[PDB]
Symmetry: D2
Subunit: 336 residues, 4 copies
């Protein structure tokens, strides 16, 4: 009848918790049987139940000394720093959803397979492996894949828009800036944050320039654009909800309307990628069930003779919206 | 001339006084006009959420402020024609209310006893000055002038240099900009601008600006060659402008930055930094604009080249420092 | 009965409609009056910075909103006496503008052909209702009624519960309160209240509230026995109230917590928690007040005892749940 | 003993150095220990989100900072017992990591060859010091001492004045407190304080503090007579403490305020205001506490009387000014 794959989550963080929320929301056939993090079940249960961005959890949440009990289903809880020591076989976890931020390579995520898992989907960029943005390149997946990435939230915002432009007009070259909600990689107060000096600064009190590979590594998702895009971010003080701008030279001359029509078609019957003509703002994207929502109000054609710059803008809930992509990619990946 | 009125003792109006005092200008602020009591303008001048305690004594009477022992009269006239500028002999008006941003509207100050007007904002087709870019275009004959937006003072110095070094054939800007008094505290009507109605401290808010569209008033060769907009975000002040240009020659990142370093050298209006700074590091800047070499980006594919150049600006104090520079000169011609 | 008009389609006005459709009220909102166009009101209704998108369809015409298929008139009359309520037979007016907070002012809606008025704010010495504290004082002869402030709906059930069980001999209240529309986005005049002139999202701002001073309107036996104020702080919504009381009885923490839990049992207005919640956990509460057992504190030396009790409340939606409970009762009398 | 080491070059550690140079102290900071490179510490000192550019020059080598042209050694030892303090002769350690908050734990600094420790936080039953309250208790043979929290530095001088003038029979404190490094940028594990795991800049978060409970260490006669806790809120620094006391005498507001004014006179640690300030007006304060006459409140029902007294504090820089006063005395015993 139905494919009932068994899933473990490594890192029950902002993304790891929303992975469970979303799986339950869509009545997915996957069963989350295990969770690994660095803390007790009490603390994970508190964090699951009460959420500063998405509000109370829509299901019952309890804990024992070794487990979460979520809508009456037990989920084992482990606390292993090192993934080779995670006992994934004890509850039969075959596809690990890897969200700790510390295993973003084939060699590192390998430890999940040494531990007895069968596959791993990485919730972040992970070098030169298969990297999937759903409804842009998920067809490249097949039965032989064992470690896969879904890139960043910014790649999931960028890829759909860039794909549509490429397919319709060509992109000669382009540059991206995402005005991006602050995340857990930043700092609450001015203090050391590894090697990235700017990341050390109080994230709710500054505009902080910040580097991102969403553009530079786009060719993993859209091969014909390898080397053609660059970009960065500015981290700003909103808790989630992000916007991505892109300034392109296209392969032909365009009008605003024409760009917008082409994107509209591309969003039609597309559960991953949305369209809006409304004068929305970042908080309106919070809880979005898209990876990306193209905003036709922000389209801008600048032109002098045959020279033409095209600016296109796309919103994304870098938290929940990404996660809806991650889950779509996970449902497909899990049944191969 | 050295007798000045401030109309609109707001964020910008109060800082104007602070900067004049700070640089010991031989300009005298003799009179102020807002919509409220001297007691409230005193509290506001004395206590600033962004820049701290006023660095001088502030006291009030029923009809005036006492600021470093100097009397400044305070009027509450909604309409500019009703302001008794003549009373204390106010010659040049610094227009910081937002309601008199045209030649015809700011004319009301002239009709009321003033000679010149300097508008703290874009003001249509009018002489519009970024200091150390086109301040040489001002003469004795000028009565009413503008110093554009803070965004224009960030963008213009950067644009001048790029144009002079390499030429800009076309370009589009985005300013990631601190929230201002034109936005809302809570979701609620704010004229026809739908986005401006949204809670400014809890949102990234796209917002129009003509800093790029009206750049031709400041840099005539760039007329019609630029476009842009803003993203208002939740910082109280401190902003940053990104320009993506197609230039007139091939360039390297080192090449772009050296030309900027050059243009910023002995330039009290336009600074340079190669440090990994952030918006709060720009608060209290004495520049109109600070080009940031660390964010320079060349995207090249063949013939085709895109060039991202980024400058910081304190949209409040920094802009003001440009406004005084422009004012001091305007008062002498 | 049945048919309702809203004056002031703001934070509270909009949420009134949302709570009404959420609970599938027989009450029918037939007209809305504000100062702006249907387009803007539609935009604001569709898109909410604190509760997300509106759960129903929202469209408009030049003179109306169309919400979940149902047409609702929009009027733009600044003086209540001119609102044409008789056109759609608006009987009960929900007064959420903040400009008609007295019997004298709100009776204008009656002059405009409404039958009753429910004011969403304190409004002097008139009937004043916190649901499930004193809604039993309502009768068929009440024509103008207040539901006080959000802060009042927070404090009252906490204080009733204390008064009944142990007695409050004297007390003082402090609410750490989300910022509102009455405060300032940037430093600038906000009437005569100096502190409210300061930037709401960048400051802790002391603020007066009448919630405790006027508590005798809801709990007569406490009249004149409480005082209090607010420290307005940078959260968009969600608030918390501390009451420090001298009781008429020696108590333990557990004893105080049992009495509160009993008072919250089967109480749709008044909730209980012993979880380590924070303000955003209350956003979207269906209660006027939620007592927090975790923060209860008994300080004693001999027979001198201080008791601190604390209650959360979503001063936007939580309060509105109370305003709608009051409204549906008002209309069946 | 003019030679000093800093452990924890964080928010407090770095401001400790800012302040010593601000007051031209003859204390000599010779070594710093933390967990990171001199590059990163130099950046953090140069550029500060709350207080802006360091007023003196800042460079670095692969094992040192160079501050105002003067060399400071930089170690990276996570266990204080391994810090080579004898290399450059650091005889007094200013312990600002938060991991050494007891005599047991800070004894390590003495094992590592230093002679005294001054802990920038509460640290159990040890000599704990609020400057201009109990710095008379410091003694030649004290080797490990505390300056408690900044909240203790806000509370204690207010309670001292009240105790001295009227007696405090019993009292309870609530501080409305800026967020700090012990909280979280996003929702996630934060040891075993559940509330501490919550986004600090998007929530009002209750949080325990022993300021009141451990006041007996600073004012022996108030031992056991106070309790309290904090509400952590989204402002970056700048905090306020409320205290509700039952006093030993019957009093008016003018009387309380006048007592407080007398205690603040010529007191470099304890300030006074009747101005209508807000939190950002305390950022940069050179007091440990500034008492605010405007929020004084007497609640009375015959015999019974509650007194609410409120004091501001810059939990970072203000506190630091007290830490430095105490350090300067300590080095001369
Ligand atoms: N905006 C976003 O938040 C966002 C969007 C897209 C992708 N991502 C990616 O997803 C991953 C997680 O992001 P996040 O914001 O949820 O981080 P987070 O800190 O919110 O969550 C990380 C979790 O992992 C745990 N952890 C840390 N090291 C661990 C280890 N060795 N083993 C097990 N658990 C460990 C932490 O306790 C925490 O609960 C990152 O790779 C990030 O780039 C984040
Ligand atoms: N804040 C910035 O970033 C910034 C930067 C550059 C330029 N400006 C420009 O300067 C002007 C003022 O900006 P702001 O941010 O200080 O605005 P603001 O809202 O802080 O201040 C406006 C002031 O003018 C007063 N006012 C309003 N109507 C008036 C009238 N009819 N007569 C007298 N006074 C009146 C208000 O009471 C207030 O004190 C605007 O045109 C704006 O575009 C602002
Ligand atoms: N936000 C809260 O926490 C809260 C909680 C409880 C009660 N209240 C009370 O509810 C009332 C409104 O609060 P709010 O936060 O919704 O205010 P708000 O400013 O969000 O909305 C007021 C609305 O009324 C409109 N308005 C102003 N003058 C008007 C007039 N003459 N005619 C018609 N409409 C007019 C405004 O345009 C706006 O849409 C106030 O009395 C307030 O005390 C507010
Ligand atoms: N910020 C305030 O409001 C405030 C006020 C008064 C007292 N304090 C106290 O002072 C101390 C520090 O507070 P803060 O806000 O500066 O914290 P912080 O996190 O900003 O500073 C801590 C510093 O210590 C370093 N550190 C951590 N572990 C270490 C170790 N094992 N060895 C050496 N260095 C280490 C960190 O890298 C960081 O630079 C705490 O005890 C705190 O209670 C803080
Ligand atoms: O305590 C007062 C109310 O809850 C909110 O008041 P306001 O919205 O009128 O400022
Ligand atoms: O009140 C200030 C305290 O001393 C600081 O507590 P903290 O350890 O959370 O910074």
């Amino acid at each position: 009848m139905a494919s009932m794959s068994k899933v473990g989550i490594n890192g029950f963080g902002r993304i790891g918790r929303l992975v469970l929320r979303r799986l339950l929301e869509v009545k997915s056939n996957i069963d989350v049987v295990a969770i690994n993090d660095l803390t007790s079940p009490k603390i994970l249960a508190y964090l699951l139940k009460h959420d500063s961005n998405y509000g109370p959890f829509p299901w019952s949440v309890d804990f024992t000394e070794d487990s979460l009990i979520v809508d009456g289903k037990s989920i084992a809880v482990y606390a292993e720093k090192e993934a080779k020591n995670i006992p994934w076989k004890a509850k039969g976890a075959e596809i690990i959803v890897e969200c700790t931020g510390f295993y973003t390579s084939a060699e590192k995520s390998q430890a999940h397979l040494d531990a007895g898992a069968k596959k791993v989907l990485i919730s972040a960029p992970a070098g030169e492996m298969k990297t999937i943005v759903y409804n842009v390149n998920d067809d490249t997946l097949d039965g032989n894949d064992t470690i896969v990435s879904v890139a960043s939230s910014t790649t999931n915002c960028l890829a759909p828009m860039a794909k549509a432009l490429h397919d319709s007009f060509g992109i000669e070259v382009g540059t991206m800036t995402t005005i991006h909600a602050y995340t857990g990689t930043q700092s609450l107060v001015d203090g050391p944050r590894g090697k990235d000096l700017r990341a050390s600064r109080a994230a709710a009190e500054n505009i902080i320039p910040h580097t991102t590979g969403a553009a530079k590594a786009i060719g993993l998702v859209i091969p014909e654009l390898s080397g053609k895009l660059k970009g960065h971010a500015q981290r700003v003080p909103v808790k989630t909800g992000s916007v991505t701008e892109l300034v392109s030279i296209l392969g032909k001359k365009v009008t605003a309307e024409e760009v917008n029509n082409a994107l509209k078609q591309a969003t039609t019957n597309n559960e991953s990628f949305g369209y809006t003509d409304e004068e929305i703002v970042s908080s309106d994207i919070i809880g979005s069930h898209f990876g990306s929502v193209f905003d036709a109000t922000q389209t801008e054609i600048t032109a002098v003779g045959d020279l033409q710059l095209v600016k296109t803008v796309a919103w994304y809930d870098n938290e929940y919206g990404f996660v809806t992509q991650l889950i779509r990619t996970l449902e497909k990946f899990a049944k191969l």
